[PDB]
Amino acid sequence: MNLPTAQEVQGLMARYIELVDVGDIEAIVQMYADDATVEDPFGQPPIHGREQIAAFYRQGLGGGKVRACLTGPVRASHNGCGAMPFRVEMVWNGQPCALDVIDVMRFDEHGRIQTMQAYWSEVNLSVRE
Amino acid sequence: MNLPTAQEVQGLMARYIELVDVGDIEAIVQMYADDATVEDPFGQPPIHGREQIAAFYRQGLGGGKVRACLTGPVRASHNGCGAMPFRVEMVWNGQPCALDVIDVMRFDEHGRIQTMQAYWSEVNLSVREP
Ligand SMILES: C[C@]12CCC(=O)C=C1CC[C@@H]1[C@@H]2CC[C@]2(C)C(=O)CC[C@@H]12
Ligand SMILES: C[C@]12CCC(=O)C=C1CC[C@@H]1[C@@H]2CC[C@]2(C)C(=O)CC[C@@H]12
Ligand SMILES: [Cl-]
Ligand SMILES: [Cl-]
Ligand SMILES: [Mg+2]
Ligand SMILES: [Mg+2]
8 A cells, every 4th residue: 555545544544443443453453554652531641662552552452342333534634644433432430431533644655564652541431421 | 832731732723623613714723833834635745834724624614515524532642742533524526425534733832833634535525314
């Protein structure tokens, strides 16, 4: 793949959600360019390169009990960037919860993720009331 | 207001769509910083200049038949930023249409939009069922 077109970005970003949904760490990390960055949440220090990004997904996901699902379409540009809204389901205080997140992802020429930025906070965490 | 809290982001961003939907250009342009930038769509170069931004909202909304509504929660950071998903309704090519967009914003200590970036392209355009 060359630089993804809009249409390609949409496909790549959907794929990435499934891969979080099924917890495949090696297939996610392989989607990232070798020298990519993660900011998640945006505002925290970035993470640099595949070693540091695999250590991140293994912390966040490795324990299981995390599902994800797109909660609308992928918005996609003509420069290799897109953004998507989704919901994470996991466990908070021994019980289910939902976290609502938006990721913005810039791709390089090769169809991999150069930069990821995940917009969420505690205001986006919900439970059963 | 100083950077805005996350809860506060959220308010500035829902209020902003509320304004877009009502079509108040001058209300919309004031929410910005003297030196704000818009990138809409992301990837097209920034515009800049309060006047360069009123004309942006004047070109975009000046018929009065645009509508806009959040389609899920604003996602806000603790560093004065947020992201939001919304759906724009308008007529184009004689057809009832809709556009799905995500805007990313930052703000300033005073709660003025400092940057904005609107993610969307023609892949997000569609025709509304009858
Ligand atoms: C890494 C992650 C998924 C991939 C993605 O793109 C965005 C996020 C951000 C929220 C993470 C989540 C994984 C599960 C996490 C670690 C929790 O249990 C608390 C916060 C949450
Ligand atoms: C300016 C705008 C609303 C405010 C906002 O926050 C983001 C956008 C970007 C898409 C614009 C839309 C207004 C209506 C436009 C001009 C169309 O008819 C096609 C593209 C679309
Ligand atoms: Cl949506
Ligand atoms: Cl949503
Ligand atoms: Mg699945
Ligand atoms: Mg490279």
